[PDB]
Amino acid sequence: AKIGIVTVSDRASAGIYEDISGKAIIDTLNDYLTSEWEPIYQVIPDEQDVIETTLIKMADEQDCCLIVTTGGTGPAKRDVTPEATEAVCDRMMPGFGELMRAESLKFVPTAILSRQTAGLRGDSLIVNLPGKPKSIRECLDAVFPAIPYCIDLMEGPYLECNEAVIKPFRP
Amino acid sequence: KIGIVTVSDRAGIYEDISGKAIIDTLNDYLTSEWEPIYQVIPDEQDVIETTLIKMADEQDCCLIVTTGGTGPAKRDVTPEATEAVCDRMMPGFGELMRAESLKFVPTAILSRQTAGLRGDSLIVNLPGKPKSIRECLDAVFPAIPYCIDLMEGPYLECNEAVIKPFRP
Amino acid sequence: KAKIGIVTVSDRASAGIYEDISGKAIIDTLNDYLTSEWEPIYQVIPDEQDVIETTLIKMADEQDCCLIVTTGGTGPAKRDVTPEATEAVCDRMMPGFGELMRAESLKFVPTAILSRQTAGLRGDSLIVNLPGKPKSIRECLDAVFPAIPYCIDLMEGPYLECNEAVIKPFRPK
């Protein structure tokens, strides 16, 4: 089981900020999973071609059953993570953005400003998350319960979870 | 006249709990006469497109409902075929169907179901499981008789005691 | 100074006689909200996709409207092309807006799912499709306007200020 983790951010990629977002993803997936898995981690600038390049590499060459991104989903000019995700996917999963936004609105009205989306590239699920750790955990909690079954639907690795933390639904 | 399309990758002879749940629900809803135009077909994007086109253009179905071919596997190509034959999409349908379906089947977020209009016909993608089909229709049908009204199609009447459609 | 575009999309309102309650309702609502100075950039136009595009383009690009709200032309009838025009002039969509407006309208009217309104960015201008009824205009705006001043700060635009007794915008520290 390989899961990709992409932090998208000029400042985090500069070695300016410490990367609290990519931290929260790895730590969350660690609380979630009891099966064996391998984190493939990268921090990259707000550059669309680079986002597209690094998603293709993880999915095509490294067999990530799942890639999660953080950053680059708001209305700022340089936020292009969703455009990059749309470009490298062959089909979109509109239910992910819908739910992540609906959950985040329990917290902040500005949840409607995220353009986060999800889609499939071959047998890889790609899911965009926002920058803030608290939002990361809340987005993953909303959406993760359905991810293992998605992977099984494309005959990928059988992800098993610590059920006291996250409960995967398999019909 | 309502079209019902089962998109499955079997192989026709089997009982089809998807199609009958659609027929049963429409039967509970409506107090006016209607004719189901039923087809089962493979998940081949051409065959789905062809079927939808025939029901809308040639057979004049006011509503066409699909079940199947809407999930994440590569072969699930129902939403693709629906966008192919429709000239305008209705984003509200999918949002509401997923948001009601996921109250019970958390994996409803994996559905790529959508809806749109081909000329005057409304096409709606539904999921495979009967209980989900019923949830999806309970959420959206209250809008459908008005929508058909605006397409100057037939005036569908409901048993107000099972479902209350809105006519502003 | 904030410039806000208001576009009324109606064959019959632009023919002229035939006064525009729905654009007035939008301007009224924005005055209810704002305590900071703004200018409304207002136009009434026909249900014609090329005229809609041309208007949205001028407002965003020449008139430097930081927010543009449209009213009319988002139902299932084939002459309703405001969403098509909006999609054509925007570089990226804001799907949170359509989702929420429809979910807020569903509280009142089952038929909110027939609405095709959307929202998007053209450069640094936000464009939002509103419904036609004055009361629905107010309910859609109450739902989305709390995100809009922060959205505009993120686009390096003017700092909008609100009357908190009326509307509470979130800006994260």
PDB file of N, CA and C in Angstrom, chain C residues 59-153:
ATOM      1  N   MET C  59     -17.226  44.773 -16.973  1.00  0.00           N
ATOM      2  CA  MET C  59     -17.224  44.977 -15.544  1.00  0.00           C
ATOM      3  C   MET C  59     -15.985  44.452 -14.855  1.00  0.00           C
ATOM      4  N   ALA C  60     -15.577  43.231 -15.178  1.00  0.00           N
ATOM      5  CA  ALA C  60     -14.399  42.629 -14.510  1.00  0.00           C
ATOM      6  C   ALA C  60     -13.092  43.344 -14.909  1.00  0.00           C
ATOM      7  N   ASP C  61     -12.952  43.640 -16.207  1.00  0.00           N
ATOM      8  CA  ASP C  61     -11.661  43.911 -16.789  1.00  0.00           C
ATOM      9  C   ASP C  61     -11.385  45.411 -16.911  1.00  0.00           C
ATOM     10  N   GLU C  62     -12.414  46.194 -17.260  1.00  0.00           N
ATOM     11  CA  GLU C  62     -12.312  47.624 -17.478  1.00  0.00           C
ATOM     12  C   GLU C  62     -12.789  48.413 -16.267  1.00  0.00           C
ATOM     13  N   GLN C  63     -13.861  47.943 -15.638  1.00  0.00           N
ATOM     14  CA  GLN C  63     -14.466  48.668 -14.547  1.00  0.00           C
ATOM     15  C   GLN C  63     -13.991  48.179 -13.182  1.00  0.00           C
ATOM     16  N   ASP C  64     -13.144  47.147 -13.188  1.00  0.00           N
ATOM     17  CA  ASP C  64     -12.483  46.624 -11.982  1.00  0.00           C
ATOM     18  C   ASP C  64     -13.440  46.372 -10.827  1.00  0.00           C
ATOM     19  N   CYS C  65     -14.574  45.751 -11.170  1.00  0.00           N
ATOM     20  CA  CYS C  65     -15.516  45.243 -10.162  1.00  0.00           C
ATOM     21  C   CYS C  65     -14.914  44.048  -9.448  1.00  0.00           C
ATOM     22  N   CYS C  66     -14.946  44.099  -8.136  1.00  0.00           N
ATOM     23  CA  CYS C  66     -14.327  43.059  -7.398  1.00  0.00           C
ATOM     24  C   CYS C  66     -15.364  41.932  -7.208  1.00  0.00           C
ATOM     25  N   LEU C  67     -16.646  42.299  -7.225  1.00  0.00           N
ATOM     26  CA  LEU C  67     -17.756  41.356  -7.142  1.00  0.00           C
ATOM     27  C   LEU C  67     -18.734  41.758  -8.200  1.00  0.00           C
ATOM     28  N   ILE C  68     -19.279  40.774  -8.902  1.00  0.00           N
ATOM     29  CA  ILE C  68     -20.325  40.916  -9.866  1.00  0.00           C
ATOM     30  C   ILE C  68     -21.428  39.904  -9.574  1.00  0.00           C
ATOM     31  N   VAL C  69     -22.653  40.381  -9.326  1.00  0.00           N
ATOM     32  CA  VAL C  69     -23.813  39.509  -9.086  1.00  0.00           C
ATOM     33  C   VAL C  69     -24.803  39.665 -10.244  1.00  0.00           C
ATOM     34  N   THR C  70     -25.316  38.551 -10.746  1.00  0.00           N
ATOM     35  CA  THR C  70     -26.212  38.555 -11.858  1.00  0.00           C
ATOM     36  C   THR C  70     -27.538  38.093 -11.252  1.00  0.00           C
ATOM     37  N   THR C  71     -28.636  38.477 -11.889  1.00  0.00           N
ATOM     38  CA  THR C  71     -29.952  38.012 -11.524  1.00  0.00           C
ATOM     39  C   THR C  71     -30.769  37.738 -12.798  1.00  0.00           C
ATOM     40  N   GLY C  72     -31.342  36.536 -12.872  1.00  0.00           N
ATOM     41  CA  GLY C  72     -32.152  36.077 -13.994  1.00  0.00           C
ATOM     42  C   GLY C  72     -31.432  35.000 -14.790  1.00  0.00           C
ATOM     43  N   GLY C  73     -32.189  34.197 -15.518  1.00  0.00           N
ATOM     44  CA  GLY C  73     -31.594  33.385 -16.577  1.00  0.00           C
ATOM     45  C   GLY C  73     -30.808  32.168 -16.096  1.00  0.00           C
ATOM     46  N   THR C  74     -31.218  31.592 -14.975  1.00  0.00           N
ATOM     47  CA  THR C  74     -30.555  30.361 -14.481  1.00  0.00           C
ATOM     48  C   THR C  74     -31.511  29.153 -14.260  1.00  0.00           C
ATOM     49  N   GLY C  75     -32.712  29.192 -14.848  1.00  0.00           N
ATOM     50  CA  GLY C  75     -33.642  28.050 -14.775  1.00  0.00           C
ATOM     51  C   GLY C  75     -33.353  26.992 -15.854  1.00  0.00           C
ATOM     52  N   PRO C  76     -34.169  25.912 -15.919  1.00  0.00           N
ATOM     53  CA  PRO C  76     -34.010  24.895 -16.957  1.00  0.00           C
ATOM     54  C   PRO C  76     -34.477  25.263 -18.370  1.00  0.00           C
ATOM     55  N   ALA C  77     -35.182  26.389 -18.569  1.00  0.00           N
ATOM     56  CA  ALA C  77     -35.661  26.739 -19.915  1.00  0.00           C
ATOM     57  C   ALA C  77     -34.446  27.002 -20.792  1.00  0.00           C
ATOM     58  N   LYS C  78     -34.524  26.705 -22.083  1.00  0.00           N
ATOM     59  CA  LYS C  78     -33.306  26.788 -22.908  1.00  0.00           C
ATOM     60  C   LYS C  78     -32.816  28.204 -23.194  1.00  0.00           C
ATOM     61  N   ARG C  79     -33.708  29.179 -23.101  1.00  0.00           N
ATOM     62  CA  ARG C  79     -33.325  30.591 -23.210  1.00  0.00           C
ATOM     63  C   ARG C  79     -32.520  31.114 -21.991  1.00  0.00           C
ATOM     64  N   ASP C  80     -32.563  30.394 -20.861  1.00  0.00           N
ATOM     65  CA  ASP C  80     -31.792  30.752 -19.641  1.00  0.00           C
ATOM     66  C   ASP C  80     -30.334  30.333 -19.785  1.00  0.00           C
ATOM     67  N   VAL C  81     -29.487  31.271 -20.203  1.00  0.00           N
ATOM     68  CA  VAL C  81     -28.057  31.017 -20.553  1.00  0.00           C
ATOM     69  C   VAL C  81     -27.056  31.803 -19.640  1.00  0.00           C
ATOM     70  N   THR C  82     -27.520  32.423 -18.542  1.00  0.00           N
ATOM     71  CA  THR C  82     -26.583  33.149 -17.637  1.00  0.00           C
ATOM     72  C   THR C  82     -25.446  32.258 -17.133  1.00  0.00           C
ATOM     73  N   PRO C  83     -25.742  30.964 -16.781  1.00  0.00           N
ATOM     74  CA  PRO C  83     -24.618  30.142 -16.317  1.00  0.00           C
ATOM     75  C   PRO C  83     -23.596  29.835 -17.381  1.00  0.00           C
ATOM     76  N   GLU C  84     -24.067  29.638 -18.594  1.00  0.00           N
ATOM     77  CA  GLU C  84     -23.190  29.401 -19.746  1.00  0.00           C
ATOM     78  C   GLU C  84     -22.267  30.584 -19.956  1.00  0.00           C
ATOM     79  N   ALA C  85     -22.817  31.809 -20.010  1.00  0.00           N
ATOM     80  CA  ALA C  85     -22.044  33.063 -20.105  1.00  0.00           C
ATOM     81  C   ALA C  85     -21.037  33.196 -19.011  1.00  0.00           C
ATOM     82  N   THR C  86     -21.424  32.832 -17.794  1.00  0.00           N
ATOM     83  CA  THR C  86     -20.525  32.954 -16.643  1.00  0.00           C
ATOM     84  C   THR C  86     -19.329  31.998 -16.735  1.00  0.00           C
ATOM     85  N   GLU C  87     -19.617  30.756 -17.051  1.00  0.00           N
ATOM     86  CA  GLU C  87     -18.621  29.748 -17.272  1.00  0.00           C
ATOM     87  C   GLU C  87     -17.626  30.166 -18.401  1.00  0.00           C
ATOM     88  N   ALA C  88     -18.123  30.780 -19.479  1.00  0.00           N
ATOM     89  CA  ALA C  88     -17.275  31.202 -20.598  1.00  0.00           C
ATOM     90  C   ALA C  88     -16.284  32.326 -20.197  1.00  0.00           C
ATOM     91  N   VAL C  89     -16.686  33.281 -19.349  1.00  0.00           N
ATOM     92  CA  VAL C  89     -15.797  34.396 -18.998  1.00  0.00           C
ATOM     93  C   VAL C  89     -14.891  34.136 -17.754  1.00  0.00           C
ATOM     94  N   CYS C  90     -15.176  33.117 -16.951  1.00  0.00           N
ATOM     95  CA  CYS C  90     -14.377  32.761 -15.787  1.00  0.00           C
ATOM     96  C   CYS C  90     -13.216  31.824 -16.118  1.00  0.00           C
ATOM     97  N   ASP C  91     -12.077  32.024 -15.450  1.00  0.00           N
ATOM     98  CA  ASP C  91     -10.893  31.217 -15.583  1.00  0.00           C
ATOM     99  C   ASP C  91     -11.012  29.984 -14.681  1.00  0.00           C
ATOM    100  N   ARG C  92     -11.754  30.091 -13.568  1.00  0.00           N
ATOM    101  CA  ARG C  92     -12.005  28.967 -12.634  1.00  0.00           C
ATOM    102  C   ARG C  92     -13.302  29.147 -11.845  1.00  0.00           C
ATOM    103  N   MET C  93     -14.002  28.045 -11.611  1.00  0.00           N
ATOM    104  CA  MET C  93     -15.303  28.059 -10.998  1.00  0.00           C
ATOM    105  C   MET C  93     -15.130  27.987  -9.502  1.00  0.00           C
ATOM    106  N   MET C  94     -16.163  28.406  -8.784  1.00  0.00           N
ATOM    107  CA  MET C  94     -16.220  28.333  -7.290  1.00  0.00           C
ATOM    108  C   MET C  94     -17.437  27.430  -7.006  1.00  0.00           C
ATOM    109  N   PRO C  95     -17.267  26.077  -7.054  1.00  0.00           N
ATOM    110  CA  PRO C  95     -18.470  25.222  -6.939  1.00  0.00           C
ATOM    111  C   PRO C  95     -19.128  25.316  -5.528  1.00  0.00           C
ATOM    112  N   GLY C  96     -18.404  25.746  -4.492  1.00  0.00           N
ATOM    113  CA  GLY C  96     -19.052  25.938  -3.151  1.00  0.00           C
ATOM    114  C   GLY C  96     -20.284  26.834  -3.203  1.00  0.00           C
ATOM    115  N   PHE C  97     -20.296  27.789  -4.137  1.00  0.00           N
ATOM    116  CA  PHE C  97     -21.362  28.802  -4.151  1.00  0.00           C
ATOM    117  C   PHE C  97     -22.679  28.225  -4.630  1.00  0.00           C
ATOM    118  N   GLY C  98     -22.674  27.615  -5.824  1.00  0.00           N
ATOM    119  CA  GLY C  98     -23.847  26.903  -6.306  1.00  0.00           C
ATOM    120  C   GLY C  98     -24.384  25.866  -5.341  1.00  0.00           C
ATOM    121  N   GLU C  99     -23.515  24.979  -4.808  1.00  0.00           N
ATOM    122  CA  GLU C  99     -23.926  23.995  -3.805  1.00  0.00           C
ATOM    123  C   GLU C  99     -24.702  24.623  -2.645  1.00  0.00           C
ATOM    124  N   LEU C 100     -24.160  25.676  -2.053  1.00  0.00           N
ATOM    125  CA  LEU C 100     -24.750  26.260  -0.873  1.00  0.00           C
ATOM    126  C   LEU C 100     -26.069  27.016  -1.192  1.00  0.00           C
ATOM    127  N   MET C 101     -26.071  27.826  -2.228  1.00  0.00           N
ATOM    128  CA  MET C 101     -27.277  28.540  -2.614  1.00  0.00           C
ATOM    129  C   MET C 101     -28.426  27.594  -2.860  1.00  0.00           C
ATOM    130  N   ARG C 102     -28.219  26.552  -3.660  1.00  0.00           N
ATOM    131  CA  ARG C 102     -29.236  25.515  -3.839  1.00  0.00           C
ATOM    132  C   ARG C 102     -29.660  24.816  -2.550  1.00  0.00           C
ATOM    133  N   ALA C 103     -28.727  24.484  -1.627  1.00  0.00           N
ATOM    134  CA  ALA C 103     -29.053  23.853  -0.325  1.00  0.00           C
ATOM    135  C   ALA C 103     -29.849  24.757   0.616  1.00  0.00           C
ATOM    136  N   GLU C 104     -29.567  26.061   0.536  1.00  0.00           N
ATOM    137  CA  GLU C 104     -30.325  27.078   1.286  1.00  0.00           C
ATOM    138  C   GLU C 104     -31.731  27.320   0.735  1.00  0.00           C
ATOM    139  N   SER C 105     -31.873  27.324  -0.586  1.00  0.00           N
ATOM    140  CA  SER C 105     -33.181  27.432  -1.223  1.00  0.00           C
ATOM    141  C   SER C 105     -34.087  26.219  -1.081  1.00  0.00           C
ATOM    142  N   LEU C 106     -33.499  25.038  -0.936  1.00  0.00           N
ATOM    143  CA  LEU C 106     -34.232  23.797  -0.726  1.00  0.00           C
ATOM    144  C   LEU C 106     -35.011  23.762   0.576  1.00  0.00           C
ATOM    145  N   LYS C 107     -34.574  24.560   1.538  1.00  0.00           N
ATOM    146  CA  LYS C 107     -35.321  24.754   2.767  1.00  0.00           C
ATOM    147  C   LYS C 107     -36.724  25.342   2.471  1.00  0.00           C
ATOM    148  N   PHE C 108     -36.827  26.154   1.428  1.00  0.00           N
ATOM    149  CA  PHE C 108     -38.073  26.809   1.056  1.00  0.00           C
ATOM    150  C   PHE C 108     -38.730  26.039  -0.063  1.00  0.00           C
ATOM    151  N   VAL C 109     -37.979  25.776  -1.130  1.00  0.00           N
ATOM    152  CA  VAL C 109     -38.591  25.286  -2.358  1.00  0.00           C
ATOM    153  C   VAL C 109     -37.885  24.080  -3.014  1.00  0.00           C
ATOM    154  N   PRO C 110     -38.547  22.908  -2.995  1.00  0.00           N
ATOM    155  CA  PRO C 110     -38.123  21.656  -3.645  1.00  0.00           C
ATOM    156  C   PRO C 110     -37.494  21.828  -5.023  1.00  0.00           C
ATOM    157  N   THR C 111     -37.943  22.848  -5.747  1.00  0.00           N
ATOM    158  CA  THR C 111     -37.525  23.113  -7.111  1.00  0.00           C
ATOM    159  C   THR C 111     -36.203  23.882  -7.222  1.00  0.00           C
ATOM    160  N   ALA C 112     -35.584  24.172  -6.077  1.00  0.00           N
ATOM    161  CA  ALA C 112     -34.253  24.789  -6.056  1.00  0.00           C
ATOM    162  C   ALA C 112     -33.217  23.926  -6.815  1.00  0.00           C
ATOM    163  N   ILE C 113     -33.497  22.631  -6.954  1.00  0.00           N
ATOM    164  CA  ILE C 113     -32.600  21.748  -7.699  1.00  0.00           C
ATOM    165  C   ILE C 113     -32.604  21.926  -9.237  1.00  0.00           C
ATOM    166  N   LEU C 114     -33.578  22.690  -9.739  1.00  0.00           N
ATOM    167  CA  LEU C 114     -33.707  23.024 -11.158  1.00  0.00           C
ATOM    168  C   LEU C 114     -32.861  24.237 -11.496  1.00  0.00           C
ATOM    169  N   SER C 115     -32.372  24.908 -10.451  1.00  0.00           N
ATOM    170  CA  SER C 115     -31.559  26.093 -10.644  1.00  0.00           C
ATOM    171  C   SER C 115     -30.146  25.693 -11.085  1.00  0.00           C
ATOM    172  N   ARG C 116     -29.636  26.430 -12.059  1.00  0.00           N
ATOM    173  CA  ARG C 116     -28.332  26.141 -12.613  1.00  0.00           C
ATOM    174  C   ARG C 116     -27.314  27.216 -12.254  1.00  0.00           C
ATOM    175  N   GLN C 117     -27.652  28.056 -11.316  1.00  0.00           N
ATOM    176  CA  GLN C 117     -26.698  29.078 -10.906  1.00  0.00           C
ATOM    177  C   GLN C 117     -25.337  28.532 -10.501  1.00  0.00           C
ATOM    178  N   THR C 118     -24.339  29.330 -10.833  1.00  0.00           N
ATOM    179  CA  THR C 118     -22.987  29.008 -10.508  1.00  0.00           C
ATOM    180  C   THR C 118     -22.243  30.303 -10.082  1.00  0.00           C
ATOM    181  N   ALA C 119     -20.931  30.176  -9.889  1.00  0.00           N
ATOM    182  CA  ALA C 119     -20.085  31.276  -9.443  1.00  0.00           C
ATOM    183  C   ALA C 119     -18.686  30.968  -9.974  1.00  0.00           C
ATOM    184  N   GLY C 120     -17.869  31.996 -10.181  1.00  0.00           N
ATOM    185  CA  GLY C 120     -16.539  31.788 -10.673  1.00  0.00           C
ATOM    186  C   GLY C 120     -15.695  33.028 -10.582  1.00  0.00           C
ATOM    187  N   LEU C 121     -14.396  32.869 -10.913  1.00  0.00           N
ATOM    188  CA  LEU C 121     -13.434  33.981 -10.924  1.00  0.00           C
ATOM    189  C   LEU C 121     -13.008  34.289 -12.319  1.00  0.00           C
ATOM    190  N   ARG C 122     -13.039  35.568 -12.652  1.00  0.00           N
ATOM    191  CA  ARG C 122     -12.409  36.070 -13.833  1.00  0.00           C
ATOM    192  C   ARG C 122     -11.286  36.981 -13.356  1.00  0.00           C
ATOM    193  N   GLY C 123     -10.043  36.523 -13.424  1.00  0.00           N
ATOM    194  CA  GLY C 123      -8.941  37.328 -12.913  1.00  0.00           C
ATOM    195  C   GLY C 123      -9.193  37.472 -11.414  1.00  0.00           C
ATOM    196  N   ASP C 124      -9.130  38.705 -10.936  1.00  0.00           N
ATOM    197  CA  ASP C 124      -9.448  38.979  -9.553  1.00  0.00           C
ATOM    198  C   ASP C 124     -10.896  39.478  -9.359  1.00  0.00           C
ATOM    199  N   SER C 125     -11.866  39.126 -10.201  1.00  0.00           N
ATOM    200  CA  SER C 125     -13.254  39.466  -9.911  1.00  0.00           C
ATOM    201  C   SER C 125     -14.042  38.187  -9.615  1.00  0.00           C
ATOM    202  N   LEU C 126     -14.852  38.219  -8.556  1.00  0.00           N
ATOM    203  CA  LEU C 126     -15.802  37.143  -8.251  1.00  0.00           C
ATOM    204  C   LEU C 126     -17.138  37.402  -8.916  1.00  0.00           C
ATOM    205  N   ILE C 127     -17.679  36.421  -9.624  1.00  0.00           N
ATOM    206  CA  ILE C 127     -18.994  36.526 -10.239  1.00  0.00           C
ATOM    207  C   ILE C 127     -19.926  35.466  -9.706  1.00  0.00           C
ATOM    208  N   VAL C 128     -21.114  35.873  -9.259  1.00  0.00           N
ATOM    209  CA  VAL C 128     -22.092  35.001  -8.616  1.00  0.00           C
ATOM    210  C   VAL C 128     -23.457  35.142  -9.296  1.00  0.00           C
ATOM    211  N   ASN C 129     -24.046  34.005  -9.731  1.00  0.00           N
ATOM    212  CA  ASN C 129     -25.390  33.986 -10.313  1.00  0.00           C
ATOM    213  C   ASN C 129     -26.418  33.882  -9.208  1.00  0.00           C
ATOM    214  N   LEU C 130     -27.328  34.856  -9.136  1.00  0.00           N
ATOM    215  CA  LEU C 130     -28.415  34.863  -8.160  1.00  0.00           C
ATOM    216  C   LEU C 130     -29.740  34.498  -8.835  1.00  0.00           C
ATOM    217  N   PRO C 131     -30.752  34.085  -8.048  1.00  0.00           N
ATOM    218  CA  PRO C 131     -32.085  33.851  -8.634  1.00  0.00           C
ATOM    219  C   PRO C 131     -32.790  35.185  -8.934  1.00  0.00           C
ATOM    220  N   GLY C 132     -34.010  35.113  -9.487  1.00  0.00           N
ATOM    221  CA  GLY C 132     -34.843  36.277  -9.794  1.00  0.00           C
ATOM    222  C   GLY C 132     -35.695  36.933  -8.711  1.00  0.00           C
ATOM    223  N   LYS C 133     -36.333  36.181  -7.822  1.00  0.00           N
ATOM    224  CA  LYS C 133     -37.218  36.809  -6.788  1.00  0.00           C
ATOM    225  C   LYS C 133     -36.448  37.636  -5.732  1.00  0.00           C
ATOM    226  N   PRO C 134     -36.916  38.874  -5.412  1.00  0.00           N
ATOM    227  CA  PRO C 134     -36.238  39.649  -4.375  1.00  0.00           C
ATOM    228  C   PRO C 134     -35.973  38.879  -3.096  1.00  0.00           C
ATOM    229  N   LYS C 135     -36.949  38.107  -2.600  1.00  0.00           N
ATOM    230  CA  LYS C 135     -36.717  37.346  -1.358  1.00  0.00           C
ATOM    231  C   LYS C 135     -35.672  36.231  -1.490  1.00  0.00           C
ATOM    232  N   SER C 136     -35.670  35.517  -2.627  1.00  0.00           N
ATOM    233  CA  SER C 136     -34.621  34.517  -2.934  1.00  0.00           C
ATOM    234  C   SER C 136     -33.224  35.125  -3.122  1.00  0.00           C
ATOM    235  N   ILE C 137     -33.191  36.308  -3.711  1.00  0.00           N
ATOM    236  CA  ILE C 137     -31.965  37.056  -3.821  1.00  0.00           C
ATOM    237  C   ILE C 137     -31.401  37.247  -2.414  1.00  0.00           C
ATOM    238  N   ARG C 138     -32.236  37.708  -1.467  1.00  0.00           N
ATOM    239  CA  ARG C 138     -31.792  37.921  -0.062  1.00  0.00           C
ATOM    240  C   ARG C 138     -31.328  36.641   0.674  1.00  0.00           C
ATOM    241  N   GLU C 139     -32.074  35.561   0.530  1.00  0.00           N
ATOM    242  CA  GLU C 139     -31.651  34.287   1.060  1.00  0.00           C
ATOM    243  C   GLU C 139     -30.356  33.740   0.429  1.00  0.00           C
ATOM    244  N   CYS C 140     -30.139  33.903  -0.895  1.00  0.00           N
ATOM    245  CA  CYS C 140     -28.894  33.401  -1.494  1.00  0.00           C
ATOM    246  C   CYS C 140     -27.741  34.242  -0.986  1.00  0.00           C
ATOM    247  N   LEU C 141     -27.949  35.529  -0.827  1.00  0.00           N
ATOM    248  CA  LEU C 141     -26.883  36.421  -0.455  1.00  0.00           C
ATOM    249  C   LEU C 141     -26.499  36.247   0.996  1.00  0.00           C
ATOM    250  N   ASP C 142     -27.506  36.130   1.883  1.00  0.00           N
ATOM    251  CA  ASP C 142     -27.295  35.836   3.319  1.00  0.00           C
ATOM    252  C   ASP C 142     -26.447  34.571   3.472  1.00  0.00           C
ATOM    253  N   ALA C 143     -26.644  33.610   2.575  1.00  0.00           N
ATOM    254  CA  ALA C 143     -25.882  32.385   2.618  1.00  0.00           C
ATOM    255  C   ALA C 143     -24.441  32.595   2.206  1.00  0.00           C
ATOM    256  N   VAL C 144     -24.186  33.364   1.142  1.00  0.00           N
ATOM    257  CA  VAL C 144     -22.812  33.365   0.573  1.00  0.00           C
ATOM    258  C   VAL C 144     -22.020  34.617   0.937  1.00  0.00           C
ATOM    259  N   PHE C 145     -22.714  35.727   1.215  1.00  0.00           N
ATOM    260  CA  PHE C 145     -21.974  36.963   1.426  1.00  0.00           C
ATOM    261  C   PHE C 145     -20.991  36.848   2.611  1.00  0.00           C
ATOM    262  N   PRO C 146     -21.334  36.079   3.692  1.00  0.00           N
ATOM    263  CA  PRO C 146     -20.284  35.902   4.746  1.00  0.00           C
ATOM    264  C   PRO C 146     -18.878  35.458   4.294  1.00  0.00           C
ATOM    265  N   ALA C 147     -18.775  34.667   3.234  1.00  0.00           N
ATOM    266  CA  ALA C 147     -17.451  34.353   2.612  1.00  0.00           C
ATOM    267  C   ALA C 147     -16.816  35.425   1.657  1.00  0.00           C
ATOM    268  N   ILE C 148     -17.563  36.460   1.279  1.00  0.00           N
ATOM    269  CA  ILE C 148     -17.147  37.294   0.129  1.00  0.00           C
ATOM    270  C   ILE C 148     -16.055  38.355   0.445  1.00  0.00           C
ATOM    271  N   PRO C 149     -16.183  39.132   1.542  1.00  0.00           N
ATOM    272  CA  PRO C 149     -15.091  40.014   1.877  1.00  0.00           C
ATOM    273  C   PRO C 149     -13.720  39.353   2.040  1.00  0.00           C
ATOM    274  N   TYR C 150     -13.636  38.217   2.762  1.00  0.00           N
ATOM    275  CA  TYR C 150     -12.380  37.473   2.812  1.00  0.00           C
ATOM    276  C   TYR C 150     -11.913  37.043   1.405  1.00  0.00           C
ATOM    277  N   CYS C 151     -12.826  36.548   0.561  1.00  0.00           N
ATOM    278  CA  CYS C 151     -12.481  36.121  -0.826  1.00  0.00           C
ATOM    279  C   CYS C 151     -11.792  37.274  -1.563  1.00  0.00           C
ATOM    280  N   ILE C 152     -12.340  38.476  -1.383  1.00  0.00           N
ATOM    281  CA  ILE C 152     -11.828  39.682  -2.007  1.00  0.00           C
ATOM    282  C   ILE C 152     -10.485  40.143  -1.428  1.00  0.00           C
ATOM    283  N   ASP C 153     -10.317  40.089  -0.109  1.00  0.00           N
ATOM    284  CA  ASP C 153      -8.973  40.276   0.495  1.00  0.00           C
ATOM    285  C   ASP C 153      -7.963  39.294  -0.099  1.00  0.00           C
TER     286      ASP C 153
END
